[PDB]
Amino acid sequence: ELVQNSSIGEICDSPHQILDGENCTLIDALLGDPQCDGFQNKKWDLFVERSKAYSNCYPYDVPDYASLRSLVASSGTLEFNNESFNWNGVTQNGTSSACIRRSNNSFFSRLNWLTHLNFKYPALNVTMPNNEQFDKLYIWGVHHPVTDKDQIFLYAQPSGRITVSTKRSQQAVIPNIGFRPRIRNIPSRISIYWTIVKPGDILLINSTGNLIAPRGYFKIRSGKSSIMRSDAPIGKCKSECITPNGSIPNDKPFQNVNRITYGACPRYVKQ
Amino acid sequence: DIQMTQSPSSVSASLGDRVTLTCRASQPIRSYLNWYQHKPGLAPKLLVYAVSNLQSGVPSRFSGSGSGTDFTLTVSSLQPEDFATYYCQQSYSTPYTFGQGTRLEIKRTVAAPSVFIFPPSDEQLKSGTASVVCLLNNFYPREAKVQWKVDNALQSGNSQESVTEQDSKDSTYSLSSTLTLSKADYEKHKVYACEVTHQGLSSPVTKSFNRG
Amino acid sequence: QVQLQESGPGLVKPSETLSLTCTVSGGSLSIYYWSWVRQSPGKGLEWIGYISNSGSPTYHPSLKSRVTISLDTSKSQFSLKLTSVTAADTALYFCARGVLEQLAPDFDSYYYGMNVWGQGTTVTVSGASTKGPSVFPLAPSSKSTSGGTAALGCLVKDYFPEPVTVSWNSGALTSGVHTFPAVLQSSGLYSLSSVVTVPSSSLGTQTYICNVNHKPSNTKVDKRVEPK
Ligand SMILES: *[C@@H]1O[C@H](CO)[C@@H](O[C@@H]2O[C@H](CO)[C@@H](O[C@@H]3O[C@H](CO)[C@@H](O)[C@H](O)[C@@H]3O)[C@H](O)[C@H]2NC(C)=O)[C@H](O)[C@H]1NC(C)=O
Ligand SMILES: *[C@@H]1O[C@H](CO)[C@@H](O[C@@H]2O[C@H](CO)[C@@H](O[C@@H]3O[C@H](CO)[C@@H](O)[C@H](O)[C@@H]3O)[C@H](O)[C@H]2NC(C)=O)[C@H](O)[C@H]1NC(C)=O
């Protein structure tokens, strides 16, 4: 039995820096969800998601959910820096009753929801240089109203268009107005997208409406960190190997507890 | 390929109580489930999206929960206008199997019906058939017993009845019973009556006519 | 607002092909999907299949090759077809507006809600042909009155198939009206009764007409009732 037929049942906080999501998913903390304020600028070598995690903000979705989840996991850092964009002619800091922060109507802490200014929301030409030597990760969104009335009162534009572009890439999104089942008393949605701006490349935003603007970038280096889903508690112990069923000593050359591992782990074999 | 099961099947609960309807699944669904409100002769309405996520026009007294295989709905204070019959879907796999349904009973007003009787019209008698109609109006519980007597002969196998669904304004039912007889059997006898026995009836009630 | 209206036959002979048609009111299309479900007598709702606005359908595997659903945005109508129908297909069919979403908290699979519904089109699959009903008066006799409250009705007897719609005084009399669900007697025909409770003082004054429509048998009947 060089295979450890049963695991510890708990995950050791050592040596790998373990960050428990608890009531938060990585994406909710990435966007900044009211209950996820305590995850800002917080690093991790391994980030454990829980089955009990929800979202308590303004409903959204991500088309390529698996790419963005693996980006933030590989970097191991939620450190963003706020950059001052030039949002002349628009109303900033849009709030909603479905995203309650500090017992008040708020929004995602890292997203700026843009509405019209005096019923005029111009075409926006915005440039961001990225003078650094490391890949920036921008998180932006597109709001899908429920009616043509809602589209008009929010952006003063029946057909909004958004075109996030760099010297290398070019993304265009079109809103989708329509009646949608209420989510926490909200029939509207938001579509989340991401854009990597490489060093020396320029970020260009051309928008006419329905834009959930980003407030900053994130630092990505595709490091050693990763992400795992588990329900085993986090205990006070030291163990090189970590599995969704708990920590595991790495003294035996094989293992069958789970095919997902992290760190100095024995090679997996089946039952 | 993939089914569910909703418990209970049909339960009565008084006005102002608190009822819980549970939908059991074959496999864990997380929150890929929904609930609807289906009334008599009306289009079913959405109550719950995902879990505990309410629709427009739904009071806060409705509230659901649950995860995995077990989900419940809870009406904090039952109101008569709700009533209806309630289902659950399995929105996780492609068959989209729906729940069996759970009947909700208001069970609040307790009263006996005002009973009427109608003889066969001569238009129908000339056609060779006699249909006597005994009417029961505004009454609860649904459980009633209407017996037919032809010259004091207990009738069976020649009568049908149907009960209206709960009129939410008064939370009462109405019952109609149609005794069918041939023309030859109708004019051969004299006394016809419908004997009503019911919880709200202190004594069995009988309404009769005496020609035929 | 948004409403749906199923339209089609009320009776289909066995082994034929059903064809109903739902209608779009005043709502945008785009991401909506369009499903129908058939309510059995009491067996429980069964899901049939649903098409995207692009036109990509998926059946319910219980119906192996029996369902073919279509879409046409020019008329804002979309129909569903059931081939080789048998007696097991008697049901009450609905059309509903489904919305396909990926909720934020859990991305694991798709959600689906039937936001808008239609009232229903009763469909029977049987070999017996249609027949018009006979409306006999339920005359409000003196024995049919209790303490100043009289009741009168109309006996709609012997018809096929369901349903029938009964109104009073061209719809001008609704209070106290109780139209009971029909019963299937031994002759294979339906029969119900529609009564109304009125003040007994208005018997010698008000004229009471009951109006019945039967879409299958293609008959429209007016019948005023006076006691005697
Ligand atoms: C993670 O999320 C769960 C679910 O929201 C939290 O559990 C819930 O916590 C709240 C308080 O934060 C409890 O609310 C209280 O409930 C009692 C009745 O039980 C009510 O009388 C109070 O007025 C108040 O509303 C709630 O009971 C509790 N639910 C459960 C099932 O425990 C949990 O606290 C969150 N954890 C973290 C670390 O954020
Ligand atoms: C929307 O809300 C954000 C905060 O959530 C506002 O950002 C705030 O903008 C002001 C600009 O007047 C910042 O003040 C500046 O601070 C720097 C030091 O960092 C100082 O040198 C400047 O003289 C100025 O006082 C403030 O720091 C900043 N707050 C945060 C948290 O970033 C934003 O202005 C709001 N939008 C609108 C349209 O008001």
Residue numbers in the entry:
A (entry chain A): 41 to 311
B (entry chain C): 1 to 212
C (entry chain B): 1 to 228
From the paper:
We describe a focused, protective antibody response, abundant in memory and serum repertoires, to a conserved region at the influenza virus hemagglutinin (HA) head interface. Known broadly protective antibodies engage sites on the major virion surface protein, influenza virus hemagglutinin (HA). These include the receptor-binding site (RBS) on the “head” of an HA subunit (1–5), sites on the HA “stem”, and a recently identified site at the interface between two heads of an HA trimer. Stem and head interface antibodies realize their full protective potential through Fc-dependent pathways that lead to the killing of infected cells rather than by blocking viral entry.
A distinct subset (five antibodies from five different subjects) has a light chain variable region encoded by the IGκV1-39 gene. The five antibodies with light chains encoded by the IGκV1-39 gene segment, each from a different donor, all engage HA similarly. The HCDR3s, while unique in sequence and length, all curl toward the light chain and create a blunt antigen-combining site that brings light chain framework regions 2 and 3 into contact with HA. This arrangement accommodates the HA-220 loop in a groove at the heavy-light chain interface, with HCDR3 tucked beneath it. The principal contacts between the light chain and HA are from residues 49 to 55: YAASSLQ in the germ line sequence. In all five structures, the side chain of Gln at position 55 hydrogen bonds with both the main-chain NH and the main-chain CO of HA residue 222. Also, in all five structures, a Ser53Asn substitution allows the Asn side chain to accept a hydrogen bond from the main-chain NH of HA residue 224 while donating a branched hydrogen bond to the carbonyls of residues 49 and 50 in the β-turn at the tip of the LCDR2 loop. The side chain of Tyr49, anchored by a hydrogen bond with an acidic residue at the sixth position in HCDR3 in all five antibodies, is in van der Waals contact with conserved HA Pro221. The HCDR3 acidic residue (supplied by IGHD3-3*01 or by n-nucleotides) then forms a double salt bridge with conserved HA-Arg229. The antibodies belonging to the IGκV1-39 subclass had the greatest breadth of binding.
